[PDB]
């Protein structure tokens, strides 16, 4: 037998209880980053290596800008939840 | 400037809303597994690779045993939550 909740992976744009940022002109930070990394390594890196690089890019490359002092220069960090039981590669 | 929530990794023995099993004579499933993999690859595998093999071992080598039909033959799958921004190796 195998666990019913097994082999799922949830890549969330942000951590529990927090906001997630989106630029009306360029799109959300998480999505920009995810695509940017997948184009370069989607076929030669493992799913966790990709998502980890996504975490790093969203964390270092983005900072919010707003006229409202309450919402400017804020940061973000994605959250990966893995129930995977094997390594996942999109190639081969 | 980096996210205050960055660089955390939570390795839960089970998924949200679920039970976590522990055999009284051998110890909890999650820990027996975590230690097997660690004493064998703790120094040559990336953290996510280690925790992934742990998920697999838990999900495959364990199954509850109980004289209580309701808790008989149940399964378990760990849950890894990573906000890490780089690959982690316990060496060099």
């Amino acid at each position: 037998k195998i666990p019913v909740e097994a082999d799922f992976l949830f890549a969330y744009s942000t951590v529990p209880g927090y906001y997630s940022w989106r630029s009306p002109g360029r799109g959300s930070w998480f999505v920009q980053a995810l695509c940017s990394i997948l184009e370069e390594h989607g076929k030669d890196l493992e799913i966790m290596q990709i998502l980890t690089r996504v975490n790093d890019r969203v964390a270092r490359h983005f900072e919010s800008q707003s006229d409202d002092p309450h919402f400017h220069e804020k940061k973000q960090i994605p959250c990966v939840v893995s129930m995977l039981t094997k390594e996942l590669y999109f190639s081969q | 400037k980096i996210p205050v929530e960055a660089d955390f990794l939570f390795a839960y023995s089970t998924v949200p809303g679920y039970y976590s099993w522990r055999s009284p004579g051998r110890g909890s499933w999650f820990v027996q597994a975590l230690c097997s993999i660690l004493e064998e690859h703790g120094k040559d595998l990336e953290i996510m690779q280690i925790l992934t093999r742990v998920n697999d071992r838990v999900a495959r080598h364990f199954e509850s045993q109980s004289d209580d039909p309701h808790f008989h033959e149940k399964k378990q799958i760990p849950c890894v939550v990573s906000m890490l921004t780089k690959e982690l190796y316990f060496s060099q």
């Binding site: 890196l45 493992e46 290596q49 590669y89 081969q92 | 040559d44 990336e46 690779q49 190796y89």
Partner: peptide, 5 residues
Amino acid sequence: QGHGE
């Protein structure tokens, strides 16, 4: 290290 398929 180097992830190896």
